[PDB]
Amino acid sequence: GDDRELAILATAENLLEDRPLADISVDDLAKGAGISRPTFYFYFPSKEAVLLTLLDRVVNQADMALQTLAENPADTDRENMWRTGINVFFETFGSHKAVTRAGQAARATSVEVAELWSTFMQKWIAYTAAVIDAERDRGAAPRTLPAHELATALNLMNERTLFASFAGEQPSVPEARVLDTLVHIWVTSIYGE
Amino acid sequence: GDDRELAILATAENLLEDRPLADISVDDLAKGAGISRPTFYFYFPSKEAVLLTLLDRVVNQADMALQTLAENPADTDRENMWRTGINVFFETFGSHKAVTRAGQAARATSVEVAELWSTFMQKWIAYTAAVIDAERDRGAAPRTLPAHELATALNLMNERTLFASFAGEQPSVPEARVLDTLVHIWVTSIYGE
Ligand SMILES: CCCCNC(=O)N1CCC(C)CC1
Numbered sequence: 051g052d053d054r055e056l057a058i059l060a061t062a063e064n065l066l067e068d069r070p071l072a073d074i075s076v077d078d079l080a081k082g083a084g085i086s087r088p089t090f091y092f093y094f095p096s097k098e099a100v101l102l103t104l105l106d107r108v109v110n111q112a113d114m115a116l117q118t119l120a121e122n123p124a125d126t127d128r129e130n131m132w133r134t135g136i137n138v139f140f141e142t143f144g145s146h147k148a149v150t151r152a153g154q155a156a157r158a159t160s161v162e163v164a165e166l167w168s169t170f171m172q173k174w175i176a177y178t179a180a181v182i183d184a185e186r187d188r189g190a191a192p193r194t195l196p197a198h199e200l201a202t203a204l205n206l207m208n209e210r211t212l213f214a215s216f217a218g219e220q221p222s223v224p225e226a227r228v229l230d231t232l233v234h235i236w237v238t239s240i241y242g243e
Numbered sequence: 244g245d246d247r248e249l250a251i252l253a254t255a256e257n258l259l260e261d262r263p264l265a266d267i268s269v270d271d272l273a274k275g276a277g278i279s280r281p282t283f284y285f286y287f288p289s290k291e292a293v294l295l296t297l298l299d300r301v302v303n304q305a306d307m308a309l310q311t312l313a314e315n316p317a318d319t320d321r322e323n324m325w326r327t328g329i330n331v332f333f334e335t336f337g338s339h340k341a342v343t344r345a346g347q348a349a350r351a352t353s354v355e356v357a358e359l360w361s362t363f364m365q366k367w368i369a370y371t372a373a374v375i376d377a378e379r380d381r382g383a384a385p386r387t388l389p390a391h392e393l394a395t396a397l398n399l400m401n402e403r404t405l406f407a408s409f410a411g412e413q414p415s416v417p418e419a420r421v422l423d424t425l426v427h428i429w430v431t432s433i434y435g436e
Pocket residue numbers: 132135136139174175177178181205208209212
């Protein structure tokens with residue numbers, strides 16, 4: 051039961067490395083998973099649904115990693131603090147490039163994909179803003195822009211920059227340079243006057 | 244000749260306010276423009292082509308405005324300098340919200356839309372980096388990150404943040420707050436150590 055569902059999800063992730071979801075058929079997915087077509091339709095209503103579940107797993111992986119970090123603060127300077135946090139997303143999404151790509155493309159066509167992305171981006175922004183607020187309260191960061199609006203722009207920067215880097219879009223920051231680039235912009239904008 | 248082409252483009256821009264390109268038919272476009280279907284196909288091979296031409300016009304409008312600014316430097320502090328520049332994009336894309344939305348969505352499905360976007364983003368990044376380099380040469384900005392990589396991340400931030408603001412995505416910066424938010428992040432990251 052969960053065996054064949056997992057195999058469907060694994061097949062989909064493997065195939066999305068090579069082609070977009072549009073050029074992957076339900077037959078392709080069932081064949082890869084060792085099942086028939088109608089047995090596929092037992093587990094998922096559509097190939098779009100498969101991509102939704104893949105994206106849900108990746109987003110929750112990132113979220114759970116960020117929670118783990120928030121419970122286990124590393125003992126470091128504020129630069130390293132933000133770097134370790136940004137790195138959760140760099141590593142988690144960067145380990146699932148094909149899902150990230152296809153998920154971000156689905157936002158324009160799937161309400162459910164858009165909603166998933168929005169839910170988690172709201173959470174991540176809210177947490178960012180709470181950390182900025184804590185830095186301001188302890189006197190380390192100046193009271194400049196509204197923390198939630200600063201957090202929003204920085205999170206959107208990271209989304210667009212990380213995803214362009216992973217896809218080798220032109221233009222993009224090289225993947226080996228993206229974490230230094232983002233961390234600089236976060237630290238200067240959060241702590242600068 | 245150019246009358247009916249222009250009418251097609253105007254009809255398309257008006258209809259994309261209400262629905263995505265997928266729910267707009269070639270019949271809808273021809274009807275709005277006062278022409279027949281086969282007369283449409285004289286002027287454009289497809290509705291996708293119409294969106295490409297709309298996006299090309301908006302991108303070149305922004306580009307020409309930025310050139311005009313680069314030839315006519317305002318006499319101001321460095322904050323205002325970047326603000327006036329960012330404002331070119333805020334105003335130009337913000338005056339064509341429906342084209343911006345539909346164009347950005349087409350990037351995932353149209354090679355020609357992706358290429359157009361890439362060409363101009365490369366230009367805008369290169370110009371940003373040249374201005375940063377000039378600020379460093381005159382001693383106003385510190386030599387921190389590679390100027391071109393900083394420019395790339397800041398331009399991608401602006402793309403994602405402006406477009407989320409215009410679309411009222413959740414999450415987004417309110418439109419009335421986006422220019423202050425971006426300018427802060429640009430100034431602190433360019434001039435901060
Ligand atoms: C990939 C979209 C979200 C990016 N968010 C992001 O990198 N972080 C959000 C939360 C904090 C603390 C660290 C950095």
